[PDB]
Amino acid sequence: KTRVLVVGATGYIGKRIVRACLAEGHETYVLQRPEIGLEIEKVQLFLSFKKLGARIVEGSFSDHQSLVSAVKLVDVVVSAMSGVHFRSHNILVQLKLVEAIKEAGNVKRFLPSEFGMDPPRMGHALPPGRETFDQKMEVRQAIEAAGIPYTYVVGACFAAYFAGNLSQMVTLLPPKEKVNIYGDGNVKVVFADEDDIAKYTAKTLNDPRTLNKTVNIRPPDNVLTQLELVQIWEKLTGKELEKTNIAAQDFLANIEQMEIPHQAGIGHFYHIFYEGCLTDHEVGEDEEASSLYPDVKYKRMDDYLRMFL
């Protein structure tokens, strides 16, 4: 049994990773930080993990030796540290975890908080959205400068943020009548249910094939244009939506006058839906999750969207 510590265990993707690790059979440890306080939903998530068999490990990012003691207990560390401007964007806090892993010396593999666009490919990214990738790159550089073996999990839009809303911004539900189409809407995007992302992570974290590699989550039936996604919804509903195409220059108009988190979102949507950054390069079968783990029957977006009917 691989021993796994999840740091960020009550996070959006973090809690899914905890559950998927348990379902995979890993001996699953979860870091419980003392600053929780009155955050009742966090406390009760930890209780729910214990009932599923997770082991609680107490530690604080402000207490270096507590982090050393935590990672000494496991073979693999997975980090799901926050990385979204409108939530919190604390990627660089992981540098303390890396340093603890360095001193501990026993960790066979570290999966840092990636789970999105492939940061070394985003050097051209618009600020402040670029902060996400610069910060993940600083963490990558610290990992490699510490000699820590790694797997970087990248390449898919979380279905809840990009599919269930037909990719409309500042909402998480399909629009009732009108939808904005980015450009012509024929740029391929990668979509994945976050529980599948979690299961691929649980499967890849002790896979010799992915030691010191980037693992792409690119399930082929889930590579879709925004128009193709919208047409899935239109079939499910029996109603066509009124589509308005937004040219690039109009999408980015006056971006510098927006709130920073909205600026970051616009910049990211630009790279995904206008530049096609998730599909503008190809990846081999030996570095793509759905090929590596064909037993994962990943949820297709027609099934995903049916939840919203």
Ligand X SMILES: COc1cc(C[C@H]2CO[C@H](c3ccc(O)c(OC)c3)[C@H]2CO)ccc1O
Single out the residue of 168, 172, 160, 175 nearest to residue 240, CA to CA. Answer: 175
> What is the 8-class DSSP label of residue 147?
T
Does the annotation flag 245 for ligand binding? no
**117 interacts with ligand X by CB under 6 A:** yes
Q: In whole angstroms, what is the distance from residue 215 CA to residue 201 CA?
A: 9
> What is the 8-class DSSP label of residue 75?
S
**44 interacts with a second copy by CB under 8 A:** yes
**116 interacts with ligand X by CB under 6 A:** yes
**12 interacts with a second copy by CB under 8 A:** yes
Does the annotation flag 83 for ligand binding? yes
Count of residues for the chain?
Answer: 309
Does the annotation flag 151 for ligand binding? no
203 given a catalytic annotation = no
Sorted by sequence, the CB contacts under 8 Å of residue 248 that are 6+ apart come out as 183, 270, 274
**202 interacts with ligand X by CB under 6 A:** no
Residue type at position 290: S
Does the annotation flag 33 for ligand binding? yes
Binding mask 92-131 vs ligand NDP (x if CB under 6 A, - otherwise)?
-x-------------------x-xx---------------
Tokens of 174: 């399909």
Choose, by CB under 6 A, the member of 132, 204, 206, 263 that binds ligand X.
Answer: 132
Q: In whole angstroms, what is the distance from residue 174 CA to residue 61 CA?
A: 39
Shortest separation between residue 194's beta carbon and ligand NDP, angstroms: 8
247 binds, among a second copy, ligand X, ligand NDP, none (CB under 5 to 8 A by kind): none
Q: In whole angstroms, what is the distance from residue 262 CA to residue 129 CA?
A: 9
Q: In whole angstroms, what is the distance from residue 214 CA to residue 44 CA?
A: 33
Site for ligand X, residues 30 to 59, rule: CB under 6 A: 38
Q: Are 89 and 131 in contact (CB under 8 A)?
A: yes
**66 interacts with ligand NDP by CB under 6 A:** no
- What residues form DSSP beta bridges with 190? 223
Q: In whole angstroms, what is the distance from residue 250 CA to residue 261 CA?
A: 19
From the list 1, 72, 96, 136, the catalytic residue is 136
Locus of tokens 């790694």? 150
Choose, by CB under 6 A, the member of 33, 109, 203, 299 that binds ligand NDP.
Answer: 33
**171 interacts with a second copy by CB under 8 A:** yes
Q: In whole angstroms, what is the distance from residue 266 CA to residue 272 CA?
A: 10
Single out the residue of 105, 114, 307, 141 nearest to residue 197, CA to CA. Answer: 114
Does the annotation flag 255 for ligand binding? no
Alpha carbon of 98 to those of 20, 94, 101: distances in Å? 23, 6, 5
Stretch that binds ligand X, among 68-76, 90-98, 192-200, 261-269 (CB under 6 A): 261-269
Shortest separation between residue 143's beta carbon and ligand X, angstroms: 18
8 binds, among ligand X, a second copy, ligand NDP, none (CB under 5 to 8 A by kind): ligand NDP
- Binding site membership for NADP(+): which residues? 10, 12-13, 33, 42, 82-83, 87, 90, 113-114, 136, 158
Contacting positions for ligand NDP (CB under 6 A): 8-14, 31, 33, 42, 61, 80-84, 87-88, 90, 93, 113, 115-116, 132, 156-158, 161
Binding site for ligand X (CB under 6 A): 38, 84, 86, 116-117, 132, 157, 161, 165, 169-170, 264-265, 268
